[PDB]
Amino acid sequence: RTIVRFNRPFLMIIVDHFTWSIFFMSKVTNPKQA
Amino acid sequence: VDRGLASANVDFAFSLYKQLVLKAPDKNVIFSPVSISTALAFLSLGAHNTTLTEILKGLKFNLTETSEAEIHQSFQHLLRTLNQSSDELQLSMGNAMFVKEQLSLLDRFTEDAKRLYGSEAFATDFQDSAAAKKLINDYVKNGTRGKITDLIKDLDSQTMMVLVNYIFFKAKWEMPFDPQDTHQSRFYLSKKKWVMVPMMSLHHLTIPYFRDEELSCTVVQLNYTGNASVFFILPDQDKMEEVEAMLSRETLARWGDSLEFREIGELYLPKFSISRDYNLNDILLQLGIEEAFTSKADLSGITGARNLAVSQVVHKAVLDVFEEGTEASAATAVKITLL
Ligand SMILES: CC(=O)[C@H]1CC[C@H]2[C@@H]3CCC4=CC(=O)CC[C@]4(C)[C@H]3CC[C@]12C
16 A cells, blocks of 8 residues: 655645646745744 | 746746745745746836846746747736636736836836736825835735735835735645544654644545656645646655756656556645745846846836836745645735836
């Protein structure tokens, strides 16, 4: 069984399939960062 | 919808990302590429000569294969498309200009601003900086449904014009997380240090998946209800910088084309809210946008004279990820003074 665990820094790219726009781009290095 | 617009805007997104990380390598990143692209396209409407070309090339347009008029019409079509009514997902993008009433504007500029970018011109008394700041911030707060409240922190009393773009996004997961499955768990800042976060989970899920062995990362796509989705890229421990260096339109196209459906036993994703505020001045300089900030600025498309210059470009963005879906908003402001 495959497990995918986002328990370390990761990237998010929120995309629109209609326009191919990148709405938002993110790196989460620390979800509780100051 | 435009293929050439998508290509330039994605090149810009990744070029911007890389500069942000170079500037602050230890920080979270969150920004809206399309908000910044649209704000600077709006600015280029009033730009001429080197000021103009620098902006358009900085936005990653190939000016040997496109023209300023094509670019503006492409952004007009994008705004129209993005702001269509929808019963599934909430998405809106707006532009505005806040202008000193005494400043003489070309009729051609204000007409084009409204026609191409959907922007009204709001008479603003910048000499009452506190009230002018409140007005712009209220416009952004209204547009972002309260998500972004303090885009403008300081406003020079001699400001002549502020161009503003906002984007508002609210979406439900196609496959939402059950909050009963959210548990405090470790989020490893490094191999040796972690923080405790609420870790959401989904079980027995079939989603697009790609293990990129060469780049030491895993890519998955989670869908929102509607025409939007999110690419999650999970680098192996301590490989984030290797992955960041490979970020490009080509890599993203590769990833998109390599995804295959896979049954995931368990997927764990933190519930989190992050925000970042940016002074983009050095960033845009690194991407080649220089003259607009200088005494050689050519914004004569706004007024008919070379009497305006950019002082500061700012951006603020917020990303909220939780069991039901995602809320994210951003706004970009271009402050302009006399020259
Ligand atoms: C198939 C898919 O998920 C779509 C959603 C977003 C789309 C990408 C959006 C950005 C983009 C712009 C381009 O001009 C090259 C293709 C790409 C890289 C698109 C490839 C196909 C993608 C990845």
